[PDB]
Structure formats: C-alpha cells, structure tokens
Design a protein around this ligand. Sequence first.
Ligand code: CLA
Ligand code: CLA
Ligand SMILES: CC(=O)O[C@H]1CC(C)(C)C(=C=C/C(C)=C/C=C/C(C)=C/C=C/C=C(C)/C=C/C=C(\C)C(=O)C[C@@]23O[C@]2(C)C[C@@H](O)CC3(C)C)[C@](C)(O)C1
Ligand SMILES: CC(=O)O[C@H]1CC(C)(C)C(=C=C/C(C)=C/C=C/C(C)=C/C=C/C=C(C)/C=C/C=C(\C)C(=O)C[C@@]23O[C@]2(C)C[C@@H](O)CC3(C)C)[C@](C)(O)C1
Ligand SMILES: CC(=O)O[C@H]1CC(C)(C)C(=C=C/C(C)=C/C=C/C(C)=C/C=C/C=C(C)/C=C\C=C(/C)C(=O)C[C@@]23O[C@]2(C)C[C@@H](O)CC3(C)C)[C@](C)(O)C1
Ligand SMILES: CC(=O)O[C@H]1CC(C)(C)C(=C=C/C(C)=C/C=C/C(C)=C/C=C/C=C(C)/C=C\C=C(/C)C(=O)C[C@@]23O[C@]2(C)C[C@@H](O)CC3(C)C)[C@](C)(O)C1
Lengths: 144, 172, 183
Amino acid sequence: EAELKHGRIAMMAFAGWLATDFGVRFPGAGEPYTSVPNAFSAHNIMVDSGAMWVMLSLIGFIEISTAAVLVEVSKGENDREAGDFCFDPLGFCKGKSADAINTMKLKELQNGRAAMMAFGGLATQTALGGVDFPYLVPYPNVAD
Amino acid sequence: AEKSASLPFLEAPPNLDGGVGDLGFDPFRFSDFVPIDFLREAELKHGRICMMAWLGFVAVDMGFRVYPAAEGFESLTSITAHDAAVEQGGMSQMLLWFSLLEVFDTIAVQQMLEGSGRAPGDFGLDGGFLKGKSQAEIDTMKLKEIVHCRLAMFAFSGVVTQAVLTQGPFPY
Amino acid sequence: AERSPSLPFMNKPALLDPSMPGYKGFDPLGLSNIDDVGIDLYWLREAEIKHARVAMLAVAGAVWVEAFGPAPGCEAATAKNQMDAFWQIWNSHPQYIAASLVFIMIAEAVSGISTTTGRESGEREPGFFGFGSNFPKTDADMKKMQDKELENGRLAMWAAMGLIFQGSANHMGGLEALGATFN
Ligand code: CLA
Ligand code: CLA
Ligand SMILES: CC(=O)O[C@H]1CC(C)(C)C(=C=C/C(C)=C/C=C/C(C)=C/C=C/C=C(C)/C=C/C=C(\C)C(=O)C[C@@]23O[C@]2(C)C[C@@H](O)CC3(C)C)[C@](C)(O)C1
Ligand SMILES: CC(=O)O[C@H]1CC(C)(C)C(=C=C/C(C)=C/C=C/C(C)=C/C=C/C=C(C)/C=C/C=C(\C)C(=O)C[C@@]23O[C@]2(C)C[C@@H](O)CC3(C)C)[C@](C)(O)C1
Ligand SMILES: CC(=O)O[C@H]1CC(C)(C)C(=C=C/C(C)=C/C=C/C(C)=C/C=C/C=C(C)/C=C\C=C(/C)C(=O)C[C@@]23O[C@]2(C)C[C@@H](O)CC3(C)C)[C@](C)(O)C1
Ligand SMILES: CC(=O)O[C@H]1CC(C)(C)C(=C=C/C(C)=C/C=C/C(C)=C/C=C/C=C(C)/C=C\C=C(/C)C(=O)C[C@@]23O[C@]2(C)C[C@@H](O)CC3(C)C)[C@](C)(O)C1
C-alpha cells in the first residue's frame, strides 16, 4: 500500500513540478500563481498564501475516507487487494486478460518507483543548485 | 397516543388531573415531584397577584392616586413608589396584613393536602357569582380565571421590565 | 452488499439501510455503529436533520438581507457581509436578538425531551415535530420529500459554513464576493 501510494504521489508531483516550471498556471488563476518564480519557491509562498492549508484539509478527507478499508481487511471481513480502489473510469483495463492486468499494474509500479527516485534529485539538486530542465548544480560554484 | 394537546409531539404527562386548564403542558414534569394541588394553588396565587399588580402599576402611572397623598407620594412613578412606601410605612402595613393572611393560607393548604376537600385557590368568597350555577358554568368561570391569570403574569413582567428599561409614560 | 455505492472499494454499512432517507452507503468510519454516552443512530439522524434545517434557513436569511436589504425597523445594520451587520444591530437593538435566544432555549429543551423519550418509546420518528405533517400524502411523497430535505440540507450545510468563514475574512458580502471572482 505504502509503495503504491508513495509512487502515485511521486509521479503526480514530478509532472506538476515540470509543468509549473514550464509556466503552466491554473486556468483563470491570478497574480499569486502567476508571480511564483519557480517550483522550488512555490511551497513557501503558497503556505504563506494559505492555499496549502486548504489542500491539506482536502487531502485529509481523502485519506480518512479511503484508509478505513485497511482495518476491514485486517478484520478479515473484506477481500480487497492492495491498491484496489475499484477506480477505472475510462475502462483501460476493463475486461482484460489477467496477465495483461498484471503487466499493467507492474507498469504502474515501475513508473512509480522511478518517479520516487526522480523526485529526490528534483529536490536535492534544485536546493543545492538551481532549477532548470536539467536542474543541475554548479559544480565549481558553491551549493550550500 | 395520549399525546399532550399543547405538544402534539410529546406524550401527555401523567400525574396530572383532568381539571380546568389541563392542556397536558408539563414538559419538565414538575408534577412528578410535587403534588398537583400545591402546584395549582401556586399558579393561581402568582397569577392573581400579577393581575392585581398590573392594574395598580398602570393606574398609578396613568395618574390615579389617593387624593390625600402622603408625604412625597407625588412626582413619583410606579417604578419609584416602592422605596417611598417603605419609608412612609405603607409597605410595612401591607407586608403585615399580607403575611397574616399567608399564615392562615398555610393552614388551609395543609388541610387541603390532608384531604379537607378544599379546592386549590378556593377561599369561599365568590360574591354570589357561583351561587346557583351548575358545575358546567362553575368550571367555565374557573377556566376563565386561569387563562387570565396566566396571561397576566406575562403582562406584568413585560410592563415592569419595559418601564425600567425605558423610563416613560404608561405605554412604554 | 459487500460494497457501498459511494465507496465501491469497501463493504456496506450494516446499520445503514437504503430505506432510510438520504441513504447512499457513506460511513467510512462506521460512526453509525455507536451506542454510548447517550448517542445512537436515532440521535445522529435527528442531529443531521436539525443541522440541515438550521443551515438552510441561515443561508437564505443572510442572502435575503444582502439582496433585499434590512427589514422595516432595522436600518442600523448597513454592512453587506451579514457579519458586521449582526454586530451593527447587536449594538443597536440587542433586545430582539437576545429575546429570540430565550425562546429558542425553551423550545430546544422540550425538543430534547421529546427526542429522548421518543427514541426510547419508538413513538416518534427522527425529525418529526408535527409541522406540515399532513402536507405530504401517500407516504411515497413523504419519502421523496424527505430525501430531498436532506439533499438540499447537506448542500446548505457546506454553503452556510462558507459564508460564515468567508465573511469573517474577506470583510465583504457573499454575493459581491462571488461577483469579484466572476469579474
Ligand atoms: C399587587 C398589588 C399591589 C401592590 C403591592 C401595590 C403597592 C402600592 N400601591 Mg397600589 N394598586 C393596586 C395594587 C397594588 N398596589 C391596584 C390593584 C390598584 C387599583 C385600585 C392600585 C391603586 C393604587 C393607587 C391609586 C395608589 C397606589 C399606591 C401604591 C403604593 C402605596 C400603597 C398604597 O397607597 O396602596 C393604595 C392601594 C389602593 C388604593 C388599591 C385599592 C384596591 C381596592 C380598594 C381593593 C380591592 C379588593 C378586592 C375587591 C377584593 C380583594 C380583597 C382581599 C383579597 C384583599 C404601593 C407601591 C399609591 C402610590 O404609589 O402613590 C404614589 C397610590 O396613590 N395603588
Ligand atoms: C439560521 C437562521 C437565521 C438566523 C440566525 C438569522 C439571524 C438574523 N437575522 Mg435573519 N432571516 C432568516 C434566517 C435567519 N436569520 C431567514 C430564513 C429569513 C428570510 C429568508 C431572514 C430574513 C431577515 C431579515 C429581513 C432581517 C433579518 C435580520 C436578522 C438579524 C437580526 C436578528 C433578528 O431577526 O431579530 C430577532 C427577531 C426575529 C428572529 C424575528 C423572526 C422570528 C421568526 C418569525 C420565528 C422563528 C422561526 C422558528 C424558530 C422556526 C421554528 C422551527 C422549529 C420550532 C420547529 C440576525 C443576525 C435583520 C437584520 O438585522 O439584518 C441583518 C433583518 O432585517 N433576517
Ligand atoms: C522554498 C520552497 O518554497 O520550496 C521548498 C520546500 C522545502 C520543503 C523547504 C524543500 C525541501 C525539502 C525536500 C523536498 C526534501 C526532500 C528530500 C528527498 C526527497 C530526499 C530523498 C533522497 C533519496 C535518496 C537519498 C535515495 C537514495 C538511493 C540510494 C542511495 C540507492 O542506493 C538506491 C539503490 O539502492 C537501490 C534501492 C537499489 C539498487 O538496485 C539501485 C541503487 C543502488 C541505486 C525544498 C526542496 O527546498 C523546496
Ligand atoms: C482505467 C481508467 O479509468 O483510465 C485511467 C485514467 C487516468 C485518470 C488518467 C488514470 C491514470 C493514470 C495516471 C494519472 C498516470 C500518471 C502517470 C505519471 C504522471 C507518471 C509519471 C512518471 C514520472 C517519471 C517516470 C519520472 C521520471 C524522472 C526521471 C527518469 C528523471 O530522473 C528526470 C531527471 O530530472 C531528474 C528528476 C533529476 C535530474 O538530475 C536528472 C533527470 C533530468 C533525468 C487512471 C487513474 O489510471 C485511470
Ligand atoms: C459575529 C458574526 O457575525 O459571526 C458569528 C456567527 C455566530 C454563530 C453568531 C457565532 C457563533 C457561534 C455561537 C456561539 C453560536 C451559538 C451556539 C450554541 C452554543 C448553540 C448551543 C446551545 C447549547 C447548549 C445550551 C448546551 C447544552 C444543553 C444541554 C446539554 C441540555 O441540557 C439539553 C438536554 O438534552 C440534554 C442533553 C438531555 C435531555 O434529556 C435534557 C435536555 C433536553 C435539557 C460567532 C462566533 O459570533 C461568529
Ligand atoms: C404548518 C406549517 O408551517 O407546515 C410547514 C411544514 C414545513 C415542512 C416546515 C414546510 C416547509 C418547507 C420549507 C420551510 C422548506 C424550506 C426549504 C429551504 C429553505 C431549502 C433550501 C435552502 C438551500 C439553499 C439556500 C442552498 C444553497 C445555497 C448555495 C448553494 C449557495 O451557493 C449560496 C452562495 O453562498 C455560496 C455558498 C457562495 C457565496 O459566495 C455566494 C452564494 C450566494 C452563491 C411547509 C410545507 O412550508 C409548511
């Protein structure tokens, strides 16, 4: 469960970081969002704005609504599998061979693991050096 | 389902009687702890005092005053009469006589509770109004008192509060 | 059912029944299964209904004052946030506000008594007070209406909270705030 969750969250974060770097802002958004210089600096400005707080409350609701299932499983009263939230709107895997569902889920895991590792550099490198498509750090120059 | 008429969403309180003014309105069920007759006497007493009080308060303010007024007792409003009466001694006179009556009332209430047969609030003085009339009308008159008594309590309370809150003429 | 409509990944709430008005099988924390400290489903049901009714009236009233202005006799409150407005009148005619609270206390107390006893006896149904009890008919209508009551009530609850919180910060009217965002 943790591995899947961490991976999904990481993949999401990576996309957002780059998109924000590219400049993408909310459709109809305002100065607070537009003014943000770089993703590396968004967290602080957003927490100051208060929007981060709003996100926290929403995320918390999701966590509590979906977490209870684990207890039910431990109780032995349900047979749901890890990561199975019965979520398939576009039916990509609806009516698919089990083997294929297996490769698909593995694909998610593989991509997720990659993203988790990816985020690390997307963070440490940026902190020490600067934010860019490569997010590299000036080797000769100081980093911290 | 034995629902109080006043409160259609609540079971009618037991321990109550079927006497005049019994609309099943006893949400807190005081009747469970205290004999009903005692309570009925109290209701009447409070109301009868309030009815009389309202009339007096209003009239004094409107201007009706004893002609041979005592010291002061002029340029005084109902709101300010209590202290004046106290110093003049009128309050003392009233307290004395009222207290004496309450003493005899105490003896009456006890007998009523012991089973003398006295109806709560009945002291015998009817002016002949109830003389000759049947239970139907007797009860009707009693109900009318009760209604007036309950209404009077609201009235007096309002007049006093308003008056002090907004010093002014009879209509506050 | 081994599943809930709202949450298709977990088993259905046992106590909760589709028959009950407003049922959508949504009780992740299983709060329905509570019977302690004087709290049970009956209490919860009654509570939801009360919250909904109060909230609905609140949003309407606030909007009405902002849109159609204060009522005759009340002109001291000019604020359009319906928050300072409260304070405006509270500093002008605090009597009416306080008086209303007095009556509410008594009514609420009797209501609590009815709920307590009614729950034990089973004579009353959560939410019933007699008002417009004869309005519905065929019972199917009652059920439909019922469900609706909760439907708009839940929505109203969110809305009401927004107004009270937003006004406490933006220092501006709700309708005009909406306009600003839309302008
Ligand atoms: C709740 C009862 C009550 C109390 C405590 C007071 C208290 C007071 N009144 Mg008041 N009053 C009352 C009722 C009451 N009144 C009623 C009902 C009336 C209508 C007549 C009046 C008319 C009245 C006047 C005209 C004046 C007062 C005044 C006063 C003050 C001085 C006392 C005085 O002069 O009494 C005098 C009281 C009366 C003359 C009332 C007479 C009522 C009749 C005679 C009694 C009826 C009895 C009834 C038929 C059967 C009952 C018998 C038995 C149960 C007792 C004092 C603050 C004086 C004052 O404050 O001046 C500044 C004053 O001038 N009162
Ligand atoms: C949650 C409900 C709620 C609350 C808390 C308020 C609170 C307030 N309103 Mg208001 N209002 C509401 C709903 C509400 N309103 C609704 C639904 C409408 C119509 C859509 C209005 C229309 C309205 C106007 C037009 C005005 C106010 C005003 C006010 C303020 C003055 C207080 C007042 O009315 O004096 C106390 C006096 C009263 C409350 C008299 C009304 C009494 C009603 C008729 C009975 C109560 C209903 C009853 C309890 C329901 C029974 C349910 C249960 C017993 C079964 C106060 C901040 C005034 C103000 O200053 O504006 C800011 C003003 O001018 N309101
Ligand atoms: C200012 C503003 O508003 O934004 C601010 C907000 C805030 C919060 C202040 C900031 C921050 C702090 C952040 C984001 C900190 C995050 C830090 C993070 C994410 C740190 C992960 C490290 C992962 C590691 C080390 C993994 C190593 C992995 C190692 C060493 C391995 O050996 C992996 C491997 O062995 C496996 C497992 C198997 C092998 O087969 C393969 C190999 C051998 C390679 C920022 C960044 O400043 C931005
Ligand atoms: C069935 C159905 O209903 O349909 C679908 C519809 C819908 C909603 C779309 C669904 C979905 C799927 C979603 C949303 C999938 C999202 C997937 C996503 C977003 C996957 C990101 C991966 C990111 C990676 C791999 C990053 C690599 C990063 C790498 C390899 C890097 O190292 C980059 C690097 O920069 C670092 C970090 C550091 C630098 O020094 C070095 C370089 C430059 C190399 C659902 C829920 O499934 C249902
Ligand atoms: C300024 C502005 O514009 O925004 C404003 C909006 C607004 C709303 C005005 C504001 C607010 C908030 C407040 C304080 C709103 C008032 C809220 C409140 C406090 C509402 C509770 C009454 C509860 C009581 C008395 C508790 C117990 C009563 C109990 C426990 C009972 O005895 C009931 C009883 O049932 C038991 C349990 C057992 C039964 O057997 C017996 C009975 C029936 C007797 C703010 C903060 O000012 C912000
Ligand atoms: C003898 C007797 O009396 O029997 C009675 C019985 C009984 C049952 C009482 C009766 C009834 C029925 C009654 C009283 C029904 C009342 C129903 C009612 C009052 C139902 C919904 C309100 C919902 C709203 C306002 C929803 C959303 C409000 C929303 C969604 C908002 O967005 C507001 C908004 O603020 C936000 C959040 C953002 C702001 O920035 C801007 C705006 C303004 C857009 C009878 C039949 O009449 C007669």
